[PDB]
Design a binder for this molecule. Structure first.
Ligand code: SF4
Length: 76
């Protein structure tokens, strides 16, 4: 389970770890990782990440600030 939780960690969207440039698909790409990464269980990486970014989370997945930007733009 632990490796699986971090399986989706690295198996998410590189766009979630890297801020989008000027493309739109990046939002859809990022958005995909966002749903798959957010619905995945929790790991020490998830808790440690939230503390590093000061984000209130525990049951959900880990998401970067740039990632949230990609999401808001995706919804428009
Ligand atoms: S939700 Fe947390 S444990 Fe799951 S892949 Fe994303 S960062 Fe890793």
């Amino acid at each position: 389970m632990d490796w699986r939780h971090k399986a989706v960690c690295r198996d998410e969207d590189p766009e979630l770890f890297f801020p989008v440039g000027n493309s739109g698909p990046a939002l859809a790409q990022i958005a995909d990782a966002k749903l798959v990464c957010n619905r995945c269980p929790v790991t020490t990486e998830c808790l440690s990440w939230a503390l590093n970014t000061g984000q209130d989370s525990g049951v959900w997945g880990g998401m970067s600030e740039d990632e949230r930007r990609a999401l808001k733009r995706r919804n428009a």
